Every structure is written in structure tokens, then in C-alpha cells.
């Protein structure tokens, strides 16, 4: 009979409770105080303009119909009580396919404080949409947003707020760093009003600032393209009479330049404009053709030539001048 005390409390709270109506329907505005604990920021898929994020989506509001007087102040209740009470219909504005985890029980909790303050946290994975601007690929920064708010309740019915200070209302766990390509720098939050045909809704916006690490693309694209240009420019060090030998340098370097041009263009989506990596490839695609038509010049005029004695110095020079000015205008933005 020791648990009949707590049984009679919960049967009394739900007696006459209407869970289809928000608390304070005709009196005030239901302030829902929220904060996010990010257990792991998942990988950003740049092909699909999306990122995954695992949150502990905490919410808290006030309900005056759930007041109780008992032996304990807080009621760390089971999960199935949360479906028998009013909970806010917070959806994500830019979510795409986001899953609430169900193993083994539903991963939600509900705590009811004795004055009527409620806490209701959910464990979610959110496959949100991050519109990114790939002009400075791969030396680019992105601010992937996560916008959430009410669905059916306007700004005169349910308003949102942060629990702690807005600097301390989105926390990222230290061990959760599932990004392999990008680099999370920090998070900034905001609040505002959106306009719809049904009404005005309070939106809650947070941004996750990411900077892409270029260490993968140096050893995949930037160094094999540099080594191809040097492989094209060693052809000036040969003799004029080796016509089949120098055209092996001419053909195979431009044939491996156009494979990297493609092998590299498949990473990022079908982009209409040209990225900053495509400006490095196209200039390097011009240096191998500038070496190939240099050989066709000296083969048509076939002692040592003044063309090869000038292209042995100018071609490593003008490639170095471009290489100095390309990185300095992009790494220091």
C-alpha cells in the first residue's frame, strides 16, 4: 500500500484533464523554455546539402492543472505519462528526415515539479538542411542552421524562450565530434518571427559555424595537379630530336590532367558556377597545353633551341607566380 499514495496522485491529476488544449488557453501565453544538448554533431554531406545532429532536445513550460501535494517535490515519471498530457508540437523548419529514437523504451523523460513546472526532454537525430555556398571550395566556411518552432500555435498562443542565457543554451559535447571533413568552431543562437498565411509564429534559430579542412584536398587534388605540371615541364629538358619521347610527356600529362579534372569534380554537387578548385585545375590545364604547343613549335622548327632555353626558366616561374597569388588570395579571406 506504499505505492498507492503515488497511484492516487496520478489518477487525480489526469481526472478531468483535457490534453487537446494548451495550458492557460484563455488567460495567458504558454511560454515554452527550451535548450539543446548536442551529444554528437554528425557528418556533413556536402552532396545533399545536409548535416546530421544528435540532440537532447529539452523543453520546459508551466501547467497549472498538474499541481500536486505529496511526499516528494519532483515526480520523475515514466515515459507514457507524456502522451496523456499537453506537450508542445515543436517541429523543425529545415528538417528533412529526423528520427526520434525508440531503443529500448522511447528515449524521452518527463519530470513534474510540485508547483506545475514541467520538463520534457527528447533524444533525436535531425537530418537538417544546410544551404551552403560553394564558391570558395575547398577553403570555405558555412553556417549550417537549425530552425525550430511551433506548428499549430501562433505567437499569441505559444512563444518560445531559452532556459539559461542564450550563450549557454546550446551546448556541444566534447567527445561528440563526428565531423571528419569540416571543423566546428562555435554556435550562435537567435529568435525571431516568421510570417505565414495562417499567422505569425515564433521561430528559434541556431547556427553551427563550420570551416572546411583542406588537408584532404591537398594530397588528393592539389599535389597531384602540381606534380603533373612539373611532369609536363620536364619535357623542356630533353632534346629536340626525341619526337616520340617528348609526345609521351605531352599526351599523358594532358590525359591525366583531364581525368583529375573529372575525378575531382564529382565530390561537390551539380553546381552551375565554378568553384575555387576548378580555377586551380583550369590554370593547370592551361600549363600542360602551353607545354604541348611549345613542343609543337620546336618540332616544326626542327643545336639547342631558344624556345626550350626560355621555357625551361619561364614555365617554372609563371607557374610559381600563379601558385603564390592563388593561395594568398584564398587562405587569407
Amino acid at each position: 500500500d506504499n505505492t498507492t499514495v503515488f497511484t492516487r496522485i496520478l489518477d487525480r491529476l489526469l481526472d478531468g484533464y483535457d490534453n487537446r488544449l494548451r495550458p492557460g488557453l484563455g488567460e495567458r501565453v504558454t511560454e515554452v523554455k527550451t535548450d539543446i544538448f548536442v551529444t554528437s554533431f554528425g557528418p556533413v554531406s556536402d552532396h545533399d546539402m545536409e548535416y546530421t545532429i544528435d540532440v537532447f532536445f529539452r523543453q520546459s513550460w508551466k501547467d497549472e492543472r498538474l499541481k500536486f501535494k505529496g511526499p516528494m517535490t519532483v515526480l520523475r515519471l515514466n515515459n507514457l505519462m507524456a502522451s496523456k498530457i499537453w506537450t508542445p508540437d515543436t517541429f523543425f523548419h529545415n528538417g528533412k528526415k529526423s528520427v526520434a529514437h525508440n531503443m529500448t523504451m522511447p528515449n524521452k523523460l518527463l519530470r513534474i515539479t510540485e508547483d506545475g513546472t514541467l520538463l520534457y526532454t527528447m533524444r533525436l537525430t535531425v537530418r537538417a538542411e544546410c544551404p551552403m555556398h560553394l564558391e570558395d571550395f575547398p577553403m570555405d566556411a558555412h553556417a549550417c542552421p537549425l530552425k525550430f518552432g511551433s506548428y499549430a500555435y501562433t505567437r499569441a498562443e505559444v512563444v518560445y524562450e531559452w532556459t539559461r542565457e542564450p550563450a549557454r543554451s546550446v551546448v556541444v559535447a566534447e567527445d561528440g565530434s563526428r565531423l571528419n571533413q569540416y571543423d566546428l568552431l562555435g554556435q550562435t543562437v537567435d529568435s525571431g518571427i516568421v510570417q505565414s498565411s495562417t499567422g505569425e509564429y515564433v521561430v528559434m534559430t541556431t547556427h553551427f559555424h563550420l570551416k572546411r579542412k583542406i588537408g584532404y584536398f591537398v594530397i588528393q587534388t592539389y599535389l597531384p595537379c602540381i606534380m603533373t605540371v612539373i611532369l609536363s615541364q620536364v619535357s623542356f629538358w630533353l632534346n629536340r630530336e626525341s619526337v616520340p619521347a617528348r609526345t609521351v610527356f605531352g599526351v599523358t600529362t594532358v590525359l591525366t590532367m583531364t581525368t583529375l579534372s573529372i575525378s575531382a569534380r564529382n565530390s561537390l554537387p551539380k553546381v552551375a558556377y565554378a568553384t575555387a578548385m576548378d580555377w586551380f585545375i583550369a590554370v593547370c590545364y592551361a600549363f600542360v597545353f602551353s607545354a604541348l604547343i611549345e613542343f609543337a613549335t620546336v618540332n616544326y622548327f626542327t643545336s639547342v633551341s631558344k624556345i626550350d632555353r626560355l621555357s625551361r626558366i619561364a614555365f617554372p616561374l609563371l607557374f610559381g607566380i600563379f601558385n603564390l597569388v592563388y593561395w594568398a588570395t584564398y587562405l587569407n579571406r
Partner: antibody, heavy 117, light 106 residues
């Protein structure tokens, strides 16, 4: 609605002072309590905040070890505590609460401290 | 820590014209930038909670504009009851305030 503070006091330097801010029309357990230092002909200066639900208190880095706040739920009043006050801290103390967008909507009438002879 | 600078320190204008306040933060404060007036030997009150969101009871001549860093308070027509200096605050972190901006009437 109505925010009330106690009247002004005269204190000697090196002594301790007690200052109160009584809230009426609303309970303290849901909204934060903000206290702010207003020097004469100068701007405002926040000194500390109070979360009365769990008793959490976070101070300004300048005023660490200078101010202390206790808050009684039954008395509907929060208390100042200035232990090592000097003669430079001659100002008026205002009471505030967290508003709609973390603003300070309701303010007290303000109590001015005076440290002289 | 966050610092707020209000420019200029003071100004002197008459009744019924345009004034533009200025308030710039050290780093990003999103929208939680509050404007407070201080009538002499009274208590402060609230003008704009958040950015560009008027409080209840203040006249419609007061308006603001919000951004990431810079925030302005604009009064279309200065009246005879606005004898107060205006303080620009912030709330994205632990709150801090500017030095205020005094004004006077001819």
C-alpha cells in the same frame, strides 16, 4: 507588477550592509532576479543574477567576492549582502526581473547607499 | 565579456524632429538588445525588448533596427516628455550596458 525596495541607509566604510527587494504580484520561482549598480552620472552595471528554482547564482567577474544574495520564497524578497564595502561604492542599487526577451521590464524604485562620515 | 558603446555622449535638439541613436557591440549579439530610458531621480523602464519590437505602453514614435553588431534607436518626432538618457543593453550573454546618451531641450 509592483517592485519594492527598502529605504536609503548611511553606513561607515569597512562595515556590512543589508538591502532588500520585495516583489509583489508575481512569484520569484519562475523569473530571474537581476541586480544592477548605477553610479551617479554614469551608465548601468550588472552585478549578479539569481535562479530561485535551484538557488543558482552567477556574478560579474569584477564583483566576485563582493556581493552575496540569499532569496526567501516565503518572504517574497531577495537580499543584498556587501561584506567589504569601501568609500568608493557610493551609488544607487536597482532591482530588476527577466522580461519577455531576456529584457528587464519591471524595475524597482531604487535604493541609494551613501558611505561618508 | 561584452562591451556596448553608445555614440554620441550627448546631443541638443528641439521638439519634433528626427534623432538616431547608435549602439555597437564588441561581438555578435543576435536580437536581445534592450533600450532603457532613465528619467532623472526615477526608475528605468523598457522601450524595445528584443530588437525592433516595441513594448506595451510606449508611443509609436520609438522604433529600432536589429542586426548582428550595430543597433540604432530612432524617434521620428521628439516630444516634451522625453527628458531622459537612453541606455543600450544586451542579453545574449550575462547582461552589460553602455554609458548611456544624454539629451537636452532648448
Amino acid at each position: 507588477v509592483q517592485l519594492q525596495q527598502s529605504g536609503a541607509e548611511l553606513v561607515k566604510p569597512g562595515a556590512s550592509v543589508k538591502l532588500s527587494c520585495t516583489a509583489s504580484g508575481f512569484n520569484i520561482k519562475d523569473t530571474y532576479m537581476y541586480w544592477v549598480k548605477q553610479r551617479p552620472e554614469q551608465g548601468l552595471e550588472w552585478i549578479g543574477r539569481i535562479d530561485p528554482a535551484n538557488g543558482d547564482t552567477k556574478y560579474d567577474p569584477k564583483f566576485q567576492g563582493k556581493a552575496t544574495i540569499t532569496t526567501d520564497t516565503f518572504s517574497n524578497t531577495a537580499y543584498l549582502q556587501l561584506s567589504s564595502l569601501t568609500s568608493e561604492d557610493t551609488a544607487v542599487y536597482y532591482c530588476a526581473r527577466k522580461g519577455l526577451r531576456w529584457a528587464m521590464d519591471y524595475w524597482g524604485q531604487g535604493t541609494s547607499v551613501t558611505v561618508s562620515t | 565579456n561584452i562591451v556596448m558603446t553608445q555614440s554620441p555622449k550627448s546631443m541638443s535638439m528641439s521638439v519634433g524632429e528626427r534623432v538616431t541613436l547608435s549602439c555597437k557591440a564588441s561581438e555578435y549579439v543576435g536580437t536581445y538588445v534592450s533600450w532603457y530610458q532613465q528619467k532623472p531621480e526615477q526608475s528605468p523602464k523598457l522601450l524595445i525588448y528584443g530588437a525592433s519590437n516595441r513594448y506595451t505602453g510606449v508611443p509609436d514614435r520609438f522604433t529600432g533596427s536589429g542586426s548582428a553588431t550595430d543597433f540604432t534607436l530612432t524617434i521620428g518626432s521628439v516630444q516634451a516628455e522625453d527628458l531622459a538618457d537612453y541606455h543600450c543593453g544586451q542579453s545574449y550573454s550575462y547582461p552589460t550596458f553602455g554609458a548611456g546618451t544624454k539629451l537636452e531641450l532648448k
